[PDB]
Amino acid sequence: LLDIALKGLKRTLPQLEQMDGNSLRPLRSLMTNLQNLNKQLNDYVTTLTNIQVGVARFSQWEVERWVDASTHELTQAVKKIHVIAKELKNVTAELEKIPQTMSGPTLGLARFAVSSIPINQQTQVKLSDGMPVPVNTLTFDGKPVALAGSYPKNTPDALEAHMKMLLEKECSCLVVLTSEDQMQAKQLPPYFRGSYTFGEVHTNSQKVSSASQGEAIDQYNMQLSCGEKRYTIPVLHVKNWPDHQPLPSTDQLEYLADRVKNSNQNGAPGRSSSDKHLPMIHCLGGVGRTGTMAAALVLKDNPHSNLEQVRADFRDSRNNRMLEDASQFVQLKAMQAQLLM
């Protein structure tokens, strides 16, 4: 059955690949092959096929009533169709490679390759329009703890997706762990500092002098704007946390955990959208320091939590690298000890 869903996909793709805007005024075939394939490969396809392309869904291509629109409104669709097709070439390879584990789809928006920093599928964040982002909803003991991702890739599309997510998921706060020296060594965008326009989203972040005085943290107030929507999310930038290492003292971790918890902490217990009002955390890779920070927030919510289960649950909801590095795990243990004392 896949002999068809593969060849009939190894020819239909290059068709959409080569398509213009008005060249839209294969698609019924492409979806046929996919429906046929319909495991870890099917969920990958389900996600892609579910991305909205014209206030609808690619798995619809009401689309006709919409096409007959402006030259501009069709180019934005074709461009979206190029992105999906590009991704689908992955399924082509996975079949042509003839599947228990599959990272969620990355529309080239991910900073690091999934082969190095994988993205668990079922917990991968998706926007209202179903566009997947390189972020995972870390969960411990069945409950979502934070949105962890790698440092946003330096591309207008990746940053636009990052900000859209911040505004839509209404994250309690943004927590950046990379130092000024690391940011200025890998050229990470200080997107959380000034004013930038990333697509349909505008961001204006002003430093909060009163709370950025300490020699360890710079706090900002970030105002995001998109259409009729507005949303301000506090930002916590840690400057004294060297990569691949724990904080200078166990007290600084606890302090860090406190300020993160004491900056928004909104969100309702047992809420249906357990995906909202969570802190968005990132260092360079969304695994090391990011994992620790998140773990530290777990101990503050409940200092009894089994740190080994925290680690195992963080690995099932993002990847195997969460909390690698013994150095940091030892500090967590120390932290828990004080909280228990």
Q: How far is CA 331 from CA 145, 182, 245, 247, 307, in A?
A: 19, 22, 10, 8, 11
Name the pairing type of β-strands 124-126 and 132-140.
Answer: antiparallel
- Residue 201 phi/psi, 5° resolution? -110, 135
Helix (H, G, I), strand (E, B) or coil at 197: strand
Q: How far is CA 334 from CA 109, 194, 196, 242, 246, in A?
A: 37, 37, 40, 19, 11
CA angle 294, 299, 302 (to 5 degrees): 125
Please give the resolution of this entry in Å, rounded to 1 decimal: 2.2
CA angle 261, 202, 139 (to 5 degrees): 35
Nearest to 30 by CA among 40, 20, 17: 17
Say how far apart CA 43 and CA 104 lie, in whole Å: 9
CA atoms within 13 A on the CB side of 15: 12
109-119 in b/e form (b: 16+ CB < 10 A) is bbbbeeeebbb
Domains belonging to the chain, first-starting first, are 1-98 (1.20.120.260), 121-341 (3.90.190.10)
Q: How many residues does the chain have?
A: 341
Nearest to 189 by CA among 131, 112, 111, 125: 111
Nearest to 201 by CA among 233, 237, 236: 233
CA angle 85, 120, 288 (to 5 degrees): 125
User: 188 is written with which tokens?
Assistant: 């990470």
Strand ordering across the sheet containing 143-149 = 124-126, 132-140, 143-149, 280-282, 174-176, 229-238, 217-226, 201-207, 195-198
How many CB atoms sit inside 10 A of residue 310's CB? Answer: 25
User: 159 is written with which tokens?
Assistant: 């940053």
User: 59 is written with which tokens?
Assistant: 């798995």
Q: How far is CA 40 from CA 100, 122, 146, in A?
A: 6, 10, 24
Nearest to 147 by CA among 225, 70, 233, 251: 233
**Which residues are part of the catalytic machinery?**
283
Nearest to 150 by CA among 287, 321, 324, 316: 287
Do 145 and 138 touch, CB atoms closer than 8 A?
yes
Do 224 and 230 touch, CB atoms closer than 8 A?
yes
Q: Alpha helix (H) ranges present in the chain?
A: 2-10, 13-17, 27-37, 40-49, 63-67, 71-96, 156-168, 180-183, 250-261, 288-301, 307-317, 326-340
CA angle 84, 85, 86 (to 5 degrees): 90
The experimental method is X-ray
Say how far apart CA 134 and CA 103 lie, in whole Å: 10
